[PDB]
């Protein structure tokens, strides 16, 4: 269950999540767009899903892409703030899961975000230990898909 | 015009939004649910739009309602954080506007949130002055519907 996945997040994992989010979450516009473009660069097959955003190759200049990229960072901000209360983390994770379920996004496809996250973390010098911590949070969402 | 509306957010208005947000934004679950339930109570005719959430009369006990309520507070958090840059504020406002446009929510019905916000603010000792400041931020979203 999603609760099980959430309830597993240990004190050390939560610590790494909060320490790395203090940095990458400080520039939501910058790192948010970096996340989305990297996803398109390494997984060109997902571009078709984001047709509402228009030409995603425009990057920062694309207002729709910029608005979306900033908003997803607040979805992560939401997750980070709910880490100590699994009950609240589960209800928010399931809300966002519906957003993707409706778009036919499987657990496997959603996990494609791990690659980009790893690179963004690395751009700020946060190593594998942190990428693994984030993979665990992403897994909570996958438990709902 | 969302841009003219955004231009209405003067120095004083922005200060009032920040000052009041420091208080209501500190308890997103509590105030978020307070907002949504007050909306349903004062405007029963809007309940039909939230069919997905189930029995909204359960308030906090409803996980779907609690997940939704916490999430909208992060939308407001988003707006506040974009106040410095009107170009970024407009792109995030348009993103959320689409979320309501697909739900068939008009500018007039979106405005019905002003009542709840005034009440939630009042319960924290923030008067008309602050209620009006928030009415201007809401107007920006209205200009995009
Ligand atoms: C860190 C992981 C991710 C987060 C936090 C996240 C967050 C979000 C949020 C907040 C929305 C807006 C929901 C709405 O307004 O309807 C969204 C939309 C979307 N997401 Fe994700 N997402 C993530 C990963 C992914 C991945 C990996 C895919 C696909 C491979 C994906 C595909 C979509 C699609 C298709 C939309 C619709 C965009 C639109 O047309 O507006 N997401 N996501
Ligand atoms: C302060 C103003 C408000 C904010 C910031 C806000 C924010 C949000 C957010 C973030 C979502 C989730 C988007 C998604 O995942 O699709 C949402 C959904 C929704 N909103 Fe609003 N909203 C506000 C006012 C209203 C009002 C006044 C109405 C109705 C008269 C309304 C009707 C809806 C509906 C029908 C949904 C879909 C709920 C669902 O099925 O999950 N919203 N809103």
Curated annotation (Swiss-Prot), chains A, B:
What keywords sit in the KW lines?
Answer: Cytoplasm, Heme, Iron, Metal-binding, Oxygen transport, Transport
GO CC annotation: what is one? cytoplasm
Query: What residues does heme b bind to?
Result: 100
Q: Which PROSITE patterns match?
A: GLOBIN (PS01033)
Q: Which domain of life is it from?
A: Eukaryota
Record text on subunit structure and interactions = Homodimer.
Instruction: Write out the similarity annotation.
Output: Belongs to the globin family.
Name this protein carries in UniProt: Globin-1
């Amino acid at each position: 269950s999603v609760y099980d996945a959430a309830a597993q997040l240990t004190a050390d994992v939560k610590k790494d999540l909060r320490d790395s989010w203090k940095v990458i979450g400080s520039d939501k516009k910058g790192n948010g767009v970096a996340l989305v473009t990297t996803l398109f660069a390494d997984n060109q097959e997902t571009i078709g899903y984001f047709k509402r955003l228009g030409d995603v190759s425009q990057g920062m200049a694309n207002d729709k892409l910029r608005g979306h990229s900033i908003t997803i960072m607040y979805a992560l901000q939401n997750f980070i703030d709910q880490l100590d209360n699994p009950d609240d983390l589960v209800c928010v994770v399931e809300k966002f899961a519906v957003n993707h379920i409706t778009r036919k996004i499987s657990a496997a496809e959603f996990g494609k975000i791990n690659g980009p996250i790893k690179k963004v973390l690395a751009s700020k010098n946060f190593g594998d230990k942190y990428a693994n911590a984030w993979a665990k949070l992403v897994a909570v969402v996958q438990a709902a898909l």
